[PDB]
C-alpha cells in the first residue's frame, strides 16, 4: 500500500509524501492543450481505444472508392462516440493501461480529447491499476457499456509538478472514502 516513486533530480530534502493519487508516467504531450485539471472526474480505463482489430482474420470488402473514406469516418465516429459518453459524464481524466500490447491508439484520439479538454495517460501497468483503485476508490471501466457516472471518481484539484524537466501528476483530495486507502512518496535524488 506504500509505493516508492523514483524520480531523477532534486535532493532528499525535496522528498514529500503525497496525500493522494500520484502518476509516474506522463501523457503523450503532443497536443498538450490543457495545462491543469481541477474539479474533474478521474476514470480508470481497463480497455484501449483503437479501431476494431479482432484476433481472427478480418476481410473488409470495398466495392466503392467512397467506402474507403467512409471506413475512416466510421473509425472516427465509433471512437468518438466512446468519448461522447465520457464528455457526457464530465470526466476529464482518463487512465489507460499498457498500450504496447495489441490495440495501442491512433493519432486521431488526441484531437478528440483536446477539443473536449480531457486528459489521457497510457502505458500503465496492470498491477498499478489495482494499487490506484484502492486509494482513489474509482471503479475501473472495462468497456463503454459499463461506463457510467457512478463508477467514476472525483477529486478537488489535479496539479502536474514539473521539476528539473521531469513532470509528475499529483491528485489532491479524495471523493469517496473507502476502507483500503493507499499512500505514496516521491523520492528525489541526484542519480539512480
Amino acid at each position: 500500500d506504500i509505493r516508492l516513486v523514483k524520480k531523477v533530480g532534486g535532493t532528499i530534502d525535496d522528498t514529500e509524501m503525497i496525500d493522494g493519487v500520484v502518476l509516474t508516467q506522463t501523457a503523450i504531450k503532443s497536443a498538450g492543450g490543457p495545462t491543469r485539471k481541477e474539479k474533474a472526474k478521474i476514470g480508470l480505463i481497463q480497455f484501449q481505444i483503437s479501431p476494431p482489430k479482432p484476433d481472427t482474420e478480418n476481410n473488409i470488402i470495398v466495392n466503392d472508392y467512397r467506402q474507403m473514406d467512409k471506413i475512416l469516418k466510421e473509425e472516427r465516429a465509433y471512437l468518438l462516440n466512446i468519448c461522447k459518453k465520457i464528455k457526457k459524464a464530465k470526466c476529464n481524466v482518463l487512465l489507460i493501461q499498457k498500450s504496447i500490447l495489441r490495440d495501442a491508439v491512433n493519432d486521431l484520439a488526441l484531437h478528440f480529447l483536446s477539443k473536449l479538454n480531457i486528459m489521457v495517460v497510457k502505458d500503465i501497468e496492470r498491477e498499478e491499476i489495482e494499487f490506484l483503485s484502492k486509494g482513489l476508490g474509482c471503479k475501473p471501466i472495462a468497456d463503454i457499456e459499463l461506463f457510467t457516472e457512478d463508477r467514476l471518481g472525483s477529486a478537488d484539484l489535479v496539479e502536474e509538478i514539473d521539476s528539473d524537466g521531469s513532470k509528475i501528476v499529483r491528485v489532491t483530495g479524495i471523493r469517496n472514502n473507502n476502507a483500503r486507502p493507499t499512500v505514496s512518496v516521491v523520492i528525489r535524488g541526484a542519480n539512480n
Binding site: 473488409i60 472508392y65 469516418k73 468518438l80 493519432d107 486521431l108 483536446s114 524537466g165 542519480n191
Partner: protein, 528 residues
C-alpha cells in the same frame, strides 16, 4: 568471478580517475585550450566541456562512471564552467590515499569532510556579494565578461557581452505561480558561415531557419496581427487497407477523390487568414501549386521539435490532423494565435522568419554568424552554457569573485576551523584545505606562470582582511590577474561568478569523493 580486496581497488580507482582528470585540466581558466577525441567511428568533437567528453570517453574501471554522472548533474544545476567544477573533486582522491594508509577510519575521513563543507557555507557568506555590491552598471555586462572566460571566445568579448545581455531581456515571463524567471533552454541559437561574430543578429523572439518551397511564392510578409498555423498532417497518396486490398478509372478515382479533398483541406486554411503555414512531410508540385494560389507562405521538410516551440511561444494550437466534433474536415479560427510583429529577414545568403512579440510565451533567439562549423563547435556549447549563468545571476544576486579568490580565502577560514574541531579530524581539515588550493595552482600551470608566488601574496591579502575586523583600507584587497601576474581587485577586471554555481559545485563534490571512499572491494561478473 574476479574479486580483489584491500587497497588494490582504491589505488586502481584513484589512479584511473586521476589519469582522465589530468586530461581535462588543461582547459582550466581563460588560458585553457580545447582538445580532440578520436572515437574510431569517424566522428570527432573538439571542445573543453567535460559533460560531453566524460560521456563520450569509454570508462575502463566502473568506479570512473561516478565522475561521469557528476558532470551530468552539473548540467541540470548550472551547466556552465565545467572546466572549473568537475576537477575540484578529482584532487580529493589523491590526498585520500595518504589518509587511508593512516589509522583514520574512512567514515572519519567522510565525517571530517561533512563538517568542513557544512561550515564552509558560512565561510562563503562572509565574502558573499550582494545584488548591488560593486558598480554593476547593468550588472549583466559585468557578469557577461566573466562568461567569456574558461572558453576561447574571450577575444570576441567586445561583442558577446552585448549579444547575450540584450537578447535575454525579453525572455522574462510569468510562470510557476507568479514567479519571475527566464525559461532557459527555450532560446534557439543559429549558426552561419563567413565574416566574424560582429555580423550576428539579435531577435527579440523566435526565429526559424527555412525558406519557401517554390520560388514564385511571396517571401515578404509585413504588418501586425500575423497568424501562423502549424500543420503536421502528412499529404501523400494513401496506402491500402489491412491487406484485404480491394475498372481502373474507379481505382484511379481513389487518388482523384483523395487529392480533391486535400485541395479542399487547403481551402479551409485559406478561410482562416494565417499568413504563415507549416508542413512537415514533403509534397509534390500538385499540392505546392495550391499553396501559391492560397496567398499564404508555406514551408516543407519541417522538424517536429521546431514546431513544438512555435505553438508554445505564439499560443496557436498545433494541428496534426483536421477534424472537429462532427465528421467534417475543416480548420477552426480558434486554433490561431497573435503576435506583435512578424517579418522575414535575409541573413547570410538565406532567409528566416522572425516571430516577435509573442503574448502566450515570451522568448528570444540569437542568430550568430561565424567562421565555419569547426570554429563554431566550441562557440555553440559555450553560448548555450552562458544562458544559465545569466539566469542564475538575475534569479539570485549572490555572486563570488573568480580566478581563485574563493579557494584562497577558504584556506584561511579552515586554518582556524581545524584547531576548533581538533582531535583526529584536524588532519582531515588540513588535507581538505590544501586540496582546494590545488585548483588555483593548476590555473597558472596552463598559463606557464608561478602559482606559489601569487598564492603566497594573495592569501596574505585575504589574511589581513580577516585578521582585522574593524578594518579606511590599508589591508583589504583581492583578485588575481593571469596576464600581468599581479593582485588587483576584480571590480576593475570585471570577473565575478555566481555564488549558486560555486555552492552547488562543492555540494556535489562532497558526495563524489565519498562514493569512492565507501568502496571496500570491486567484483566483476563475466558476461554471457
Amino acid at each position: 568471478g574476479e574479486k580483489i580486496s584491500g587497497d588494490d581497488i582504491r589505488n586502481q580507482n584513484v589512479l584511473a580517475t586521476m589519469a582522465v582528470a589530468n586530461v581535462v585540466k588543461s582547459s582550466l581558466g581563460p588560458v585553457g585550450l580545447d582538445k580532440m577525441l578520436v572515437d574510431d567511428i569517424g566522428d570527432f568533437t573538439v571542445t573543453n566541456d567535460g559533460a560531453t567528453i566524460l560521456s563520450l570517453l569509454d570508462v575502463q574501471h566502473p568506479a570512473g562512471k561516478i565522475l561521469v554522472e557528476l558532470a551530468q548533474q552539473q548540467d541540470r544545476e548550472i551547466g556552465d564552467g565545467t572546466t572549473s567544477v568537475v576537477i575540484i573533486a578529482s584532487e580529493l582522491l589523491k590526498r585520500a590515499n595518504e589518509l587511508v594508509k593512516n589509522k583514520i577510519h574512512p567514515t572519519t575521513i567522510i565525517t571530517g569532510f561533512r563538517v568542513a563543507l557544512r561550515e564552509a557555507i558560512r565561510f562563503i557568506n562572509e565574502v558573499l556579494s550582494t545584488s548591488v555590491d560593486t558598480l554593476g552598471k547593468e550588472t549583466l555586462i559585468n557578469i557577461a565578461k566573466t562568461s567569456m572566460s574558461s572558453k576561447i571566445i574571450g577575444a570576441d568579448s567586445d561583442f558577446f557581452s552585448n549579444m547575450v545581455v540584450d537578447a535575454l531581456l525579453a525572455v522574462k515571463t510569468q510562470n510557476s505561480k507568479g514567479e519571475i524567471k527566464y525559461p532557459v533552454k527555450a532560446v534557439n541559437v543559429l549558426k552561419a558561415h563567413g565574416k566574424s561574430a560582429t555580423e550576428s543578429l539579435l531577435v527579440p523572439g523566435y526565429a526559424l531557419n527555412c525558406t519557401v518551397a517554390s520560388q514564385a511564392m511571396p517571401k515578404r510578409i509585413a504588418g501586425g496581427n500575423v497568424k501562423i498555423a502549424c500543420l503536421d498532417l502528412n499529404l501523400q497518396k494513401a496506402r491500402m487497407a489491412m491487406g484485404v486490398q480491394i475498372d481502373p478509372e474507379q481505382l484511379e478515382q481513389i487518388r482523384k477523390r483523395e487529392a480533391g479533398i486535400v485541395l479542399e483541406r487547403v481551402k479551409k486554411i485559406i478561410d482562416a487568414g494565417a499568413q504563415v503555414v507549416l508542413t512537415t512531410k514533403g509534397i509534390d508540385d500538385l499540392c505546392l501549386k495550391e499553396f501559391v494560389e492560397a496567398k499564404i507562405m508555406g514551408v516543407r521538410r519541417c522538424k517536429k521539435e521546431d514546431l513544438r516551440r512555435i505553438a508554445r511561444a505564439t499560443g496557436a494550437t498545433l494541428v496534426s490532423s483536421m477534424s472537429n466534433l462532427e465528421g467534417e474536415e475543416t480548420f477552426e479560427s480558434s486554433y490561431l494565435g497573435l503576435c506583435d510583429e512578424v517579418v522575414q529577414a535575409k541573413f547570410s545568403d538565406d532567409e528566416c522568419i522572425l516571430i516577435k512579440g509573442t503574448s502566450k510565451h515570451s522568448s528570444s533567439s540569437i542568430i550568430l554568424r561565424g567562421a565555419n562549423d569547426y570554429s563554431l563547435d566550441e562557440m555553440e556549447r559555450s553560448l548555450h552554457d552562458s544562458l544559465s549563468v545569466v539566469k542564475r545571476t538575475l534569479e539570485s544576486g549572490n555572486v563570488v569573485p573568480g580566478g581563485g579568490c574563493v579557494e584562497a580565502a577558504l584556506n584561511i577560514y579552515l586554518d582556524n576551523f581545524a584547531t576548533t574541531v581538533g582531535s583526529r579530524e584536524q588532519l582531515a581539515i588540513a588535507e581538505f584545505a590544501a586540496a582546494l588550493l590545488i585548483i588555483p595552482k593548476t590555473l597558472a600551470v596552463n598559463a606557464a606562470k608561478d602559482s606559489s608566488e601569487l598564492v603566497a601574496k594573495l592569501r596574505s591579502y585575504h589574511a589581513a582582511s580577516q585578521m582585522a575586523k574593524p578594518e579606511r583600507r590599508s589591508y583589504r584587497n583581492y583578485g588575481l590577474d593571469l596576464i600581468r601576474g599581479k593582485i588587483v581587485d576584480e571590480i576593475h577586471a570585471g570577473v565575478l561568478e555566481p555564488t549558486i554555481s560555486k555552492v552547488k559545485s562543492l555540494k556535489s563534490a562532497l558526495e563524489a569523493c565519498v562514493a569512492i571512499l565507501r568502496i571496500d572491494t570491486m567484483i566483476t561478473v563475466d558476461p554471457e
